[PDB]
């Protein structure tokens, strides 16, 4: 996260860290949608060009974390995957369309003051909350700067970072990338003339772009950190996966009934 802030403790209890077994390292962010299901970005697990294609054994999921590197014995919970599901029509060849993925835990985690699920939007909430001008929040342990002087500091934060960005008009979004944006995407970030900044960045993928409803007081996950061109560049915006449009696929995979 660029131009963000340290998060407060338990300020985003649905935030999940995607940890790599060997070598140990941070792959991406994710969100907890239920005691046993995790939602992330597909490109975190599968991206041929960068020669990336992980499997259930290669990873670990870490829930209830604040710090990026510490092993939080008393608050975090480490789980193993049972099965991973990637959208059949996820396009990793040209635009990252449908960059979404679900992960099944081996055993349900126990909710706590540091571990709690986020909500998924319904037609009405989506309808009324996803409007240009409205602000959403982004979180992650990703890079703090697009680029930086090697060895002089540490590109990654100590604790979870948070940033609040506004949604941008499709027309504005479309006129900013030579990439082919689709209906399963959306953008956010300030405009050059807005006087503020911020953006997600490498390592932030899979993180949730959430929103709060003043009527029912609950948090809703409207998007997923997906792609971008640089980090925090003027006249450039971050792209997110449209969770609402992909909701039937989620529903189909989950099968609660």
């Amino acid at each position: 996260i660029v131009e963000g802030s340290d998060a407060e403790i338990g300020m985003s209890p649905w935030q999940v860290m995607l940890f790599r077994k060997s070598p140990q390292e941070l792959l991406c962010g994710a969100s907890l949608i239920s005691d046993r299901w995790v939602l992330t970005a597909a490109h975190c697990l599968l991206y041929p060009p960068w020669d990336k294609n992980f499997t259930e054994n290669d990873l670990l999921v870490r829930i209830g974390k604040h710090s990026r590197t510490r092993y939080e014995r008393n608050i975090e919970k480490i789980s193993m995957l049972e099965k991973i599901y990637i959208h059949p029509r996820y396009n990793w060849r040209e635009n990252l369309d449908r960059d979404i993925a679900l992960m099944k835990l081996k055993k349900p985690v126990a909710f706590s003051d540091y571990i709690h699920p986020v909500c998924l939007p319904d037609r009405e909430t989506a309808a009324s909350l996803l409007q240009a001008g409205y602000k959403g929040r982004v979180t992650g342990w990703g890079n703090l700067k697009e680029t930086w002087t090697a060895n002089v500091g540490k590109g990654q934060p100590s604790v979870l970072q948070v940033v609040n960005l506004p949604i941008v008009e499709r027309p504005v979004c479309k006129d900013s990338t030579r990439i082919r944006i689709t209906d399963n995407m959306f953008c956010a970030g300030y405009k050059p003339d807005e006087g503020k900044r911020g953006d997600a960045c490498e390592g932030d993928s899979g993180g949730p772009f959430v929103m709060k409803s003043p009527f029912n007081n609950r948090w809703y996950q409207m998007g997923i950190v997906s792609w971008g061109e640089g980090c925090d560049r003027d006249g450039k915006y971050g792209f997110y996966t449209h969770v609402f449009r992909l909701k039937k696929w989620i529903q189909k995979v989950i099968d609660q009934f």
Binding site: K21, S22, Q24, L60, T69, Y71, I78, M80
Partner: peptide
């Protein structure tokens, strides 16, 4: 960096 987690998880 990372502090170590129980080896039980790391194979």
């Amino acid at each position: 960096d990372f502090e170590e987690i129980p080896e039980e998880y790391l194979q």
